[PDB]
Amino acid sequence: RRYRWRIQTAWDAGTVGYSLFQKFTERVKELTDGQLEVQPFPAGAVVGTFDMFDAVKTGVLDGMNPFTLYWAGRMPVTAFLSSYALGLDRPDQWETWFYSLGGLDNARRAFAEQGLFYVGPVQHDLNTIHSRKPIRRFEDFKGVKLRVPGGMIAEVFAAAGASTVLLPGGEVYPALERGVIDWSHNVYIMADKQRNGIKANFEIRHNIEDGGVQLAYHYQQNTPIGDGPVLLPDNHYLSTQTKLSKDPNEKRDHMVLLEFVTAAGITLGMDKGEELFTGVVPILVELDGDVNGHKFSVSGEGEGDATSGKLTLKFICTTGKLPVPWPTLVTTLVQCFSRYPDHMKQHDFFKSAMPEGYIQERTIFFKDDGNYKTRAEVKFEGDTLVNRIELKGIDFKEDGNILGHKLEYSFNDGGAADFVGPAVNYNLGFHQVAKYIIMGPPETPAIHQPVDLMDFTINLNRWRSLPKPLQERFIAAVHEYSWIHYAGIQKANLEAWPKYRQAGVEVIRLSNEDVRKFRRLAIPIWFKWAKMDKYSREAFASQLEYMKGIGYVTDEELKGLSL
Ligand SMILES: [Ca+2]
C-alpha cells in the first residue's frame, strides 16, 4: 500500500541541517508517487542520538540519518566510512572511494551483519574547532578539554595531550559554558542574608608558562554600601570569557582586557539601579597594592555594556614594573556588568545596589605560595562606574610562580569543542561561548574531519519488505540528497563566517609544521583501527591503495606499518 518510515536524524531542530532533511522527506514522496513516506524526527525526539543504532536495529525506528562514525565503538569499519585525520580530504575522493573503489558494498556487508541496510553516504562539510583557549600551535592542545565524536577522531587529539569527551552536538553549548568537563572558572553566586549581600567561593587555574598549573582559590563576599533595598538571588552562576592582549604603542607595563560575562544556571519557566546600565557606561579602576612589601599602583579605564555583557578595559602599572603577573589581578580588577537574561533579572544583586554600590572583599590563596587580601568599593562617581581596590599580599616565595613571573599571559578555562561546520555551529550558538576558531593552515584547513559524512541506514527487515522498485528509487533519492544537502550546508557556511567576526571570534590558523606533528600521530592510529576486524581491514586497505595512487601517502612515512 503506502509505506511509512520513521527516520530520526542527527541534526537538531533549528539547524540548517534539519531543514534540509525535512525537505528530503517531501522529495521522497514526490519520487515515489506518495508510496513511500518518511516521517522525519529531529535529534532526540524518539531516542537519544547515540541510541539510534539500537533503535533502528530493533525496529523502534525504521531508519536513521546519523554521522556514520558514531558507531565506531561497536563497528570499527564505520571509523573508515567518514573522514579521519589527514587522510582523503575532498568530497569527490570519498564519492570515488564509495561508488567505484568498493566502499559502498564494503559498508553494506558490514551493516547487514547487524540487521541494518546501509543505503549510501550523505555528503556534508568539513568541521571546525571552537575553543575558549587560544590554541596557536600543536603544543597548546595539551590539557585542553575537547568535545569530539569519539573513535579515531578522539584518539588523535588524546595522543596530542587533550582530554576528550563525547557529547551530542545539542549538548555542546552548555558544556562549553561550564568548562566542558572536570573544572571551570564559573562563579556560583549565593545569597548571604546576614550581610544582606552575596558570597562566592571558586578556584582559578593559572597556566605556568613551561607547564603546568598554579591554583588560586578565591573566597568572596559582597555587601551593599548604602541602605536601599537590594535583590538577594537564588543560586546561579556567572560565566566569563576573557581575552588578554597588549597595546603595541604603549610602553608602560600594561594589560588590554576584553571580557564577555553572562549569568546562567536558572531554568526558564519554573514556578531601580538596573536602569543605570541600559547603555554603555564608562569605567575607572584604581588599585593600590603591596605584595611582600613590593608597592605598586594600577589604573584602568574603559567601558562596559551590560546588555551585551561586554567589557573593554586597559590597565597600566603607573609605578613602573608590575611585581606580579597580570593574570593574577584579573579577578580583582565589576560583576555589575554581567548580562542577566530576562527571566533572571530578579537575581541581579550587583545592579540592585547601585548607585551607592557595594563592597567586595576577597581572600585569594595561591597553592604552595602566598595569598592576596583585597577590599574594593564598586559604585558610581557621577556617571562613571568606579572600582577602587586595596590589595595586600603576604607569604609569597620570591622563588615562586607569582613573584618569579612564571605564569602564561592568558586567562581561560581550557574548554573547546568540535561539532560540525560553521553555519550549524552558529545555529547552536557556539559563537557566544567560544571566541576562537582553531583551523589548520591554508594547505590543510581541516585536520581531523575534512569530509564529515552522514548516511541513511534502514532496519533490514523493513528494507526487505519494500518492493524492489521503491528500494531503487530510495537509493537514488538518497544519492541526490547527498549533494543537495552538501550544497545547502555550503551555502549557509558562506553566510556564517562574517557573523563570527561580528561576534568577536578570532580564527586561528595552525602551521604546516603543526600538521606534520599531527600526521605522525594519525598514521599509526589509522593502522590500529584498520586491524580491528575484516571489514575495517578491507576498507582501509582500499583507501590506502587509493591514497598511494594520488600521492597522499608515501611508503617511507609508514616506517614499516603494514596490514
Ligand atoms: Ca565533528
Author numbering: 11 to 281, 295 to 356, 360 to 589
List passages from the publication reporting this PDB structure.
In an effort to obtain molecular insight into the structure and mechanism of eLACCO1, we determined the crystal structure of eLACCO1 in the l-lactate-bound state at a resolution of 2.25 Å. The overall structure reveals that the cpGFP-derived and TTHA0766-derived domains are closely associated via an extensive interaction surface that contains numerous molecular contacts. The TTHA0766-derived domain of eLACCO1 retains the same dimeric structure as TTHA0766 itself. Trp509 in the dimer interface forms a hydrophobic interaction with its symmetry-related self via π-π stacking. Mutagenesis of this residue abrogated l-lactate-dependent fluorescence presumably due to disruption of the dimeric structure, providing support for the conclusion that eLACCO1 functions as a dimer. The structure of eLACCO1, which we assume to be representative of eLACCO1.1, reveals that the imidazole side chain of His195 is likely a key moiety for mediating changes in the chromophore protonation state. The eLACCO1 crystal structure reveals that Arg142 forms a salt bridge with Asp439 in the l-lactate-bound state. This salt-bridge may further limit residual interaction of Asp439 with the chromophore (possibly due to increased distance or more effective charge neutralization) and thereby contribute to increased brightness of the l-lactate-bound state and a higher ΔF/F. To decrease the affinity for l-lactate, we introduced the structure-guided Tyr80Phe mutation to remove a hydrogen bond between l-lactate and eLACCO1. This produced the low-affinity eLACCO1.1 variant with apparent Kd of 3.9 mM.
